[PDB]
Design a protein around this ligand. Structure first.
Ligand SMILES: O=C(Nc1cncc2ccccc12)[C@@H]1CCOc2c(Cl)cc(Cl)cc21
Ligand SMILES: O=C(Nc1cncc2ccccc12)[C@@H]1CCOc2c(Cl)cc(Cl)cc21
Lengths: 305, 300
């Protein structure tokens, strides 16, 4: 019993975190094989950040300008190149702790673990979701850029996020490991704002299934709904549309609990229209949307890594 | 900016997780140097659960009865001893991944990260607090026994909890790494119940300071209170009493935000009286009590 926000074990990722210093800027790098990946803004100063020509800035750099430190050992940079918003620093040593890994780009609603780092040292691990507005509501202070988001599949780490910046509202923006930003953001000091966020409906339904699995069942009702009628109500309350794909992914949880997806949707519809009435679900007075259906199945079945 | 429930990076603990099998029971063990620590109930059968005599059961065991597996390698047990409710299995190999570590007994209100494991394999990591009733509200399934709670300060892992069991309400009970249970619990199937849980008041105040640091000010008010008046109100909402120690520990946060402890205390009394009125604090509609003052200063 129990349901917690649970991150993947971070060990395989901790063995890849290094410190990248370029001039006055120190941030984190991800050392995989003989390459160190980090945000390309490490090569910027004050003027550069306002209107940066990164290709021009990187051409003026040499390998010895990049100071890479793995633990207490200095790695020597033997090459540098840029792929979108990420800088790739070729080093003379392959990381002996390189795990089985992939670079994947995730979609909004998907969750991942963040290994927050400062000066190449992991300080914390937390679970979060890629919001529908492509920001993440993380916890990051100055020096955390280069911290990575990941999932673990069998014995394979899928790196899906690298932290780049904090938006004016306190939410965070970053890129996949190929340097492509999630969302309409840019790595430059300019006026940038996250779009109005919406609730991840499929994850709320998965979390209601996790609550039923844990014995919390007051919100269940006799009713069902059509997918279209539910989606009309979802739009009204800034909830993402629920697709047939989402209904199919919730199938195993529906079979396990005996509550059809559209039956759970009628529960959710009433929760939205009437509130919790002083009650809580899994110790929360709000509907939680940062647990995907796979997260609920993984946790409520004990899948290990 | 941002405030999240954050666990410590679990790598230093993952390298210590092993599988301990004794007869039909398989649970987790913590391999540090040449010793594997695990719950002593791994030596229990069906009729040795309501009233087991662990000293008598352990005397009947030999080293060859304990099957320890670290990854795909079988460790050879060369000695066994019991320290309170923990079993210590001396092995013929020191764990090369043994980090700098300490065994620490924590107090209620203190937080720690849990590395949930099954069959000696880490499946997830989450942040917990030792409840005032000495239980933890974890997320554990059958086979999670031996999973450990820890904190990391600098390079050193302080092991503070080993999971032993789930109570009838779904909450969890366990021991420190010297086998001493937290709370009035025993490692047997006898009738046991967690006492009525209360809210960790000092942790709620620390979390309100984290909210002010993050730009949330709506719950602030022009009032202050005496410590005694705050406790008389707080206790009526099943909140732990706030001691002078707690007021002192909140001093740095009070200095940083400019809001005196007793001023924050009056804001908390108001929050208890009115509820949140549709508003949230740090993305939560309830008062969060699993962030200590130390966690807030660290994360902010
Ligand atoms: O956002 C940035 N760093 C941070 C990242 N995460 C949490 C922070 C909390 C507090 C302060 C900084 C934080 C840097 C420095 C500010 O200016 C920029 C600009 Cl203009 C662009 C880019 Cl891509 C990065 C950055
Ligand atoms: O609770 C126990 N294991 C578990 C631990 N954590 C979460 C669980 C969730 C679901 C099922 C089992 C779980 C064991 C087996 C059952 O009975 C006992 C008794 Cl009577 C005493 C002791 Cl010390 C341990 C245990």
């Amino acid at each position: 019993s129990g349901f917690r926000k649970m991150a993947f074990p971070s060990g395989k990722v901790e063995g890849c975190m290094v410190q990248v210093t370029c001039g006055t800027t120190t941030l984190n790098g991800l050392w995989l094989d003989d390459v160190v990946y980090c945000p390309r803004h490490v090569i910027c100063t004050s003027e550069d950040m306002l209107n940066p020509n990164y290709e021009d800035l990187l051409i003026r750099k040499s390998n010895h300008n990049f100071l890479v430190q793995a633990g207490n050992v200095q790695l020597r940079v033997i090459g540098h190149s840029m792929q979108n918003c990420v800088l790739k620093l070729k080093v003379d040593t392959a990381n002996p702790k390189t795990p089985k890994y992939k670079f994947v780009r995730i979609q909004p609603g998907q969750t991942f673990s963040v290994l927050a780092c400062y000066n190449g040292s992991p300080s914390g691990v937390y679970q979060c979701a890629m919001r529908p507005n492509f920001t993440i509501k993380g916890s990051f202070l100055n020096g955390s850029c280069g911290s990575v988001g990941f999932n673990i599949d069998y014995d394979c780490v899928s790196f899906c996020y690298m932290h780049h910046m904090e938006l004016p509202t306190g939410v965070h923006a970053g890129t996949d490991l190929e340097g492509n930003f999630y969302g309409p953001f840019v790595d430059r000091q300019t006026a940038q704002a996250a779009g109005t966020d919406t609730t991840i409906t499929v994850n709320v339904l998965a979390w209601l299934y996790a609550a039923v699995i844990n014995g919390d069942r007051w919100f269940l009702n006799r009713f069902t709904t059509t997918l279209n009628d539910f989606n009309l109500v979802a739009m009204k309350y800034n909830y993402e549309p629920l697709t047939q794909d989402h209904v199919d992914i919730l199938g195993p949880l529906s079979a396990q609990t005996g509550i059809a997806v559209l039956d759970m949707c009628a529960s959710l519809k009433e929760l939205l229209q009437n509130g919790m009435n002083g009650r809580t679900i899994l110790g929360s007075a709000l509907l939680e949307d940062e647990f995907t259906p796979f997260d609920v199945v993984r946790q409520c079945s004990g899948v290990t890594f």
